[PDB]
Amino acid sequence: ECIENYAKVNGIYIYYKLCKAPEEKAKLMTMHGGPGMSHDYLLSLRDMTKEGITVLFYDQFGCGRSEEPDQSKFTIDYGVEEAEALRSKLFGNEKVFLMGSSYGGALALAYAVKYQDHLKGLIVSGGLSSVPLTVKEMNRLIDELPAKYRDAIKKYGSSGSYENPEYQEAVNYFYHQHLLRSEDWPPEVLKSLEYAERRNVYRIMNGPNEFTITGTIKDWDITDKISAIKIPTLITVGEYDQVTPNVARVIHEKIAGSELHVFRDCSHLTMWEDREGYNKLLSDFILKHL
Ligand SMILES: CC(C)C[C@H](N)C(=O)O
């Protein structure tokens, strides 16, 4: 099994799960989304240990099983420092592959922009370089849904009545559409969601729900800086991904030599909707830029 621990990283205590690969060829670091969820929903990537890839899972500040820092430190730049701190604390000065999902992806970019040196490669899945953009794209998605749910979002959403069932209905509908297509959601995913709704990070940084991004990161945007990234980068996104491929395009268009894979019939959590296919792509990429 994977080695688990609750160690002090850059100040607060962070939990991490390091699944060493039998005959590892490379070490992959992962960043869950949210912000304010957990590594739990990224456990499908563990399969990559069968391809000689060690996967480092970990709950970011104030997430999952990790300690919560001063609310002033609830910033992306802080996550970056935490990430680097952890990387060094565990691998000292070894260059590794960094994979982020959704917010995690955006967080990864921010990291790369500053510490791309410690990176042999970068992977952004359902990631984003601008929240405003992603939000703009999410609205389009909302309006594209059937009137029934669409208007429901617009009504209770403005009344700040997210508890309402007619609203919850739309939300969940959207989820089973752009978050995790026609699936029977695995525990791990329902584990990360349970965490976000339990901790404060999501509430503060993100806001109410997915398409309702009013948190502190509402206006974050580093598109005009991601170009500085030169290491191998694999940008993935699902056909029906909530963080539309259009968003992923903005990243691909800025990072030269980057690849862009759209997972047909898949939404946001492609790592589950196509576990084997998803895992294979990343492992191929990783070993390809070994
Ligand atoms: C910024 C949000 C769209 C990120 C989302 N909470 C996720 O991790 O999938």
Cβ neighbour number for residue 63 with a 10 Å cutoff:
27
CA atoms within 13 A on the CB side of 250: 22
Whether omega for the bond prior to residue 186 falls within 30 degrees of 0, making it cis, is no
202 Cα nearest atom in ligand 1: 6
Q: What angle do CA 283, 96, 123 make, to 5 degrees?
A: 50
Q: Classify residue 239 by its DSSP letter.
A: T
Cβ neighbour number for residue 285 with a 10 Å cutoff:
21
Partners of 98 in the β-ladder: 29, 122
Sequence letter at residue 101: S
The answer to whether the beta carbons of residues 28 and 52 sit under 8 Å apart is no
Query: What length is written for the chain?
Result: 290
Q: Which residue intervals of the chain are DSSP H helices? A: 76-91, 103-115, 131-144, 147-158, 165-174, 187-196, 201, 223-226, 245-254, 270-273, 275-288
106 Cα nearest atom in ligand 1: 1
Spatial distance between the Cα atoms of 95 and 172, rounded to a whole number of angstroms? 40
The answer to whether the beta carbons of residues 65 and 59 sit under 8 Å apart is yes
- What is residue 80's three-state secondary structure? helix
What are the structure tokens assigned to 155, written together?
A: 């009504």
Is CATH 3.40.1030.10 what the domain over 1-290 is classified as, yes or no? no
Whose alpha carbon is nearest atom 9 of ligand 1?
A: 102
Partners of 7 in the β-ladder: 14
The structure tokens 């921010």 sit at 110
- What is residue 127's three-state secondary structure? coil
Cβ neighbour number for residue 168 with a 10 Å cutoff:
14
Active-site residue, 268 included: yes
Strands 119-125 and 96-101: parallel
Spatial distance between the Cα atoms of 24 and 94, rounded to a whole number of angstroms? 14
Closest CA to 39 of 16, 12, 7: 16
Closest CA to 127 of 55, 34, 195: 34
Closest CA to 124 of 146, 141, 102, 144: 102
Q: How far is the CA of 24 from the centre of ligand 1 (A)?
A: 30
Spatial distance between the Cα atoms of 83 and 101, rounded to a whole number of angstroms? 14
Ligand 1: residues within 6 Å at CB?
Answer: 33-34, 37, 102-103, 206, 210, 213, 243, 268
Closest CA to 137 of 56, 209, 232, 242: 242
Q: Which residues contact 133 (CB under 8 A, 6 or more apart)?
A: 221, 223, 247, 250
Spatial distance between the Cα atoms of 218 and 27, rounded to a whole number of angstroms? 32
Q: How far is the CA of 25 from the centre of ligand 1 (A)?
A: 30
What are the structure tokens assigned to 7, written together?
A: 């160690």
- What is residue 22's three-state secondary structure? coil
- Which residue out of 197, 243, 270 has the highest number of ligand 1 atoms within 8 Å of its CB and is therefore the one to mutate? 243
- What is residue 135's three-state secondary structure? helix
